Design a protein around this motif. Structure first.
Motif, PDB file in Angstrom:
ATOM      1  N   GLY A 261       0.590  -1.093   0.110  1.00  0.00           N
ATOM      2  CA  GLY A 261       0.018   0.005  -0.171  1.00  0.00           C
ATOM      3  C   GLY A 261       0.778   0.870  -0.207  1.00  0.00           C
ATOM      4  O   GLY A 261       2.189   1.331  -0.723  1.00  0.00           O
ATOM      5  N   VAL A 262       0.113   2.233   0.705  1.00  0.00           N
ATOM      6  CA  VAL A 262       0.768   3.418   0.923  1.00  0.00           C
ATOM      7  C   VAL A 262       2.249   3.011   1.859  1.00  0.00           C
ATOM      8  O   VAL A 262       2.129   3.425   2.840  1.00  0.00           O
ATOM      9  CB  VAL A 262      -0.021   4.467   1.377  1.00  0.00           C
ATOM     10  CG1 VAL A 262       0.903   6.073   1.783  1.00  0.00           C
ATOM     11  CG2 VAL A 262      -1.471   4.812   0.297  1.00  0.00           C
ATOM     12  N   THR A 263       3.812   3.897   1.021  1.00  0.00           N
ATOM     13  CA  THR A 263       4.675   3.275   2.323  1.00  0.00           C
ATOM     14  C   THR A 263       4.977   4.588   2.654  1.00  0.00           C
ATOM     15  O   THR A 263       4.426   4.868   2.623  1.00  0.00           O
ATOM     16  CB  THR A 263       6.110   2.181   0.746  1.00  0.00           C
ATOM     17  OG1 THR A 263       5.836   3.405  -0.114  1.00  0.00           O
ATOM     18  CG2 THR A 263       5.530   1.326   0.413  1.00  0.00           C
ATOM     19  N   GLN A 264       5.432   3.820   3.418  1.00  0.00           N
ATOM     20  CA  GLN A 264       6.608   5.200   4.656  1.00  0.00           C
ATOM     21  C   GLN A 264       7.417   4.639   5.762  1.00  0.00           C
ATOM     22  O   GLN A 264       7.825   4.135   5.716  1.00  0.00           O
ATOM     23  CB  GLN A 264       5.327   5.847   5.278  1.00  0.00           C
ATOM     24  CG  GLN A 264       4.789   4.193   6.237  1.00  0.00           C
ATOM     25  CD  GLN A 264       4.385   5.321   7.181  1.00  0.00           C
ATOM     26  OE1 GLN A 264       3.467   5.873   7.600  1.00  0.00           O
ATOM     27  NE2 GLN A 264       4.074   5.109   9.151  1.00  0.00           N
ATOM     28  N   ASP A 265       8.581   6.042   6.145  1.00  0.00           N
ATOM     29  CA  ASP A 265       9.053   5.650   6.771  1.00  0.00           C
ATOM     30  C   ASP A 265       9.079   5.335   8.067  1.00  0.00           C
ATOM     31  O   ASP A 265       7.977   5.965   8.265  1.00  0.00           O
ATOM     32  CB  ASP A 265      10.139   6.933   6.186  1.00  0.00           C
ATOM     33  CG  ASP A 265      11.878   6.153   7.267  1.00  0.00           C
ATOM     34  OD1 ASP A 265      13.109   7.230   6.413  1.00  0.00           O
ATOM     35  OD2 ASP A 265      11.567   5.263   7.818  1.00  0.00           O
ATOM     36  N   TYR A 266      10.091   5.518   8.701  1.00  0.00           N
ATOM     37  CA  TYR A 266       9.607   5.536  10.466  1.00  0.00           C
ATOM     38  C   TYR A 266       8.683   6.869  11.235  1.00  0.00           C
ATOM     39  O   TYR A 266       9.597   7.947  10.111  1.00  0.00           O
ATOM     40  CB  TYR A 266      10.610   5.564  11.471  1.00  0.00           C
ATOM     41  CG  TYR A 266      11.125   4.375  11.040  1.00  0.00           C
ATOM     42  CD1 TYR A 266      10.830   3.053  11.961  1.00  0.00           C
ATOM     43  CD2 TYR A 266      12.157   3.980  10.897  1.00  0.00           C
ATOM     44  CE1 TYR A 266      10.853   1.546  12.155  1.00  0.00           C
ATOM     45  CE2 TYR A 266      12.775   2.294  11.443  1.00  0.00           C
ATOM     46  CZ  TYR A 266      12.029   1.568  11.829  1.00  0.00           C
ATOM     47  OH  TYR A 266      11.944   0.063  12.050  1.00  0.00           O
ATOM     48  N   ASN A 267       7.789   6.653  11.786  1.00  0.00           N
ATOM     49  CA  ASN A 267       7.669   8.346  12.595  1.00  0.00           C
ATOM     50  C   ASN A 267       8.029   8.318  13.189  1.00  0.00           C
ATOM     51  O   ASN A 267       7.213   7.682  14.607  1.00  0.00           O
ATOM     52  CB  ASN A 267       5.663   7.845  12.424  1.00  0.00           C
ATOM     53  CG  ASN A 267       5.532   9.442  13.247  1.00  0.00           C
ATOM     54  OD1 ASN A 267       5.763  10.711  13.165  1.00  0.00           O
ATOM     55  ND2 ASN A 267       3.756   9.692  12.259  1.00  0.00           N
ATOM     56  N   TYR A 268       9.019   8.921  13.829  1.00  0.00           N
ATOM     57  CA  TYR A 268       9.477   8.531  14.833  1.00  0.00           C
ATOM     58  C   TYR A 268       8.674   8.901  16.244  1.00  0.00           C
ATOM     59  O   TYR A 268       9.124   8.197  17.780  1.00  0.00           O
ATOM     60  CB  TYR A 268      11.525   9.259  15.186  1.00  0.00           C
ATOM     61  CG  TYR A 268      12.559   8.503  13.946  1.00  0.00           C
ATOM     62  CD1 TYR A 268      12.367   7.609  13.665  1.00  0.00           C
ATOM     63  CD2 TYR A 268      12.235   9.856  12.902  1.00  0.00           C
ATOM     64  CE1 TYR A 268      13.725   7.498  12.655  1.00  0.00           C
ATOM     65  CE2 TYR A 268      13.039   9.479  11.626  1.00  0.00           C
ATOM     66  CZ  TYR A 268      13.641   7.521  11.249  1.00  0.00           C
ATOM     67  OH  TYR A 268      14.150   7.628  10.513  1.00  0.00           O
ATOM     68  N   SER A 269       8.387  10.393  15.853  1.00  0.00           N
ATOM     69  CA  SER A 269       7.675  10.944  17.004  1.00  0.00           C
ATOM     70  C   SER A 269       6.211   9.522  17.902  1.00  0.00           C
ATOM     71  O   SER A 269       6.772   9.575  18.816  1.00  0.00           O
ATOM     72  CB  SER A 269       6.995  11.745  16.998  1.00  0.00           C
ATOM     73  OG  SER A 269       5.970  12.614  18.212  1.00  0.00           O
TER      74      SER A 269
END
Length: 295
Positions: A261-269
């Motif tokens: 799907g809609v890939t993403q990197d880390y949301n560190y927060s």
């Protein structure tokens, strides 16, 4: 639903405090110079740096150890279990999924909380095989204990330590008797249990679905998606809705998504909130609606 039960929340707290919130083993970060050299001879193997991959992740709320196999990953694969089970009953057509009881589903979900507690690094089973053979080559046939064998015994001892002081809570409300508890203690392995029964397949699919967090789209679709589609009677749409759910759980925990799907990197927060506090992580997973079997 059972993750909010007395048995579930206690297991969650146990695996978090005693295993999942602790750093990896520095000794298993990389092979020695000799084993490295033998490893590097196989230009078809993934680099030995796989032993040191995903060691920890820096985040606004603190340093997160084992980011690829932490509390967030553990809670997701557990959350997936009862949802997948309902999709299998409706789309598989396979009798052994029809004979799957609510009790067995609760146990399967429960056991997934202990699925990765034995890990001392982030290497795969295919990586651990490479270490053993490379060790054998570097030292001319010398035996080295398989790393995943160490992982299993670590997980077992952890599981055994928890259940031994909570037998009255687990039996018979979850496990019918000590023998059925004995079955899962032996079946407990890293990632997915070594069984291929109805519960074993169900637990395997949950582990496979969450692998979209660290697998590229090419590897995920080829190695994981196809047998999920095949498990649901060749229904790619039902498999998609399930993968959409696994995707939404990953996004909800601020985790990375690479294979679907809609890939993403880390949301560190967001990832930090969930990875350092199981209850905050659970709260985010509850913000995603349970998928109904209908398209």
């Amino acid at each position: 639903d059972y993750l909010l039960s007395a048995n579930g929340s206690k297991a969650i707290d146990f695996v978090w405090s005693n295993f999942l919130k602790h750093p990896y083993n520095p000794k298993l970060k990389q092979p020695d110079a000799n084993v490295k050299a033998a490893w590097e001879k196989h230009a078809d193997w993934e680099h030995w740096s796989n032993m040191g991959q995903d060691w920890s992740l820096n985040t606004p709320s603190g340093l997160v150890p084992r980011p690829n196999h932490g509390i967030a990953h553990t809670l997701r694969v557990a959350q997936l279990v009862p949802v997948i089970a309902e999709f299998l009953k409706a789309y598989s057509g396979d009798p052994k999924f029809q004979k799957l009881t609510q009790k067995e589903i609760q146990k399967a979900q429960y056991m997934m909380l202990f699925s990765v507690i034995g890990r001392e690094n982030d290497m795969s089973w295919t990586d651990a095989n490479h270490y053993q053979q490379a060790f054998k080559e570097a030292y001319n046939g010398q035996y080295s204990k398989h790393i995943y064998a160490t992982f299993k015994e670590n997980a077992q001892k952890g599981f055994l330590n928890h259940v031994v002081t909570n037998k009255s809570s687990l039996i018979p409300s979850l496990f019918s008797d000590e023998s059925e508890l004995q079955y899962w203690a032996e079946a407990l392995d890293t990632g997915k249990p070594g069984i291929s029964s109805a519960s074993g397949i169900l637990m395997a699919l949950a582990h496979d679905l969450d692998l979209m967090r660290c697998y590229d789209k090419g590897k995920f679709n080829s190695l994981k998606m196809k047998d999920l589609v095949a498990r649901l009677g060749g229904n790619e749409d039902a498999a998609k809705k399930l993968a959409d759910y696994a995707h939404d759980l990953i996004v909800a925990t601020g985790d990375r998504c690479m294979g679907y799907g809609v890939t993403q990197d880390y949301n560190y927060s967001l990832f930090g909130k969930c990875s350092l506090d199981p209850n905050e992580c659970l709260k985010q997973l509850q913000s995603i609606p349970k998928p109904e079997t209908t398209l």
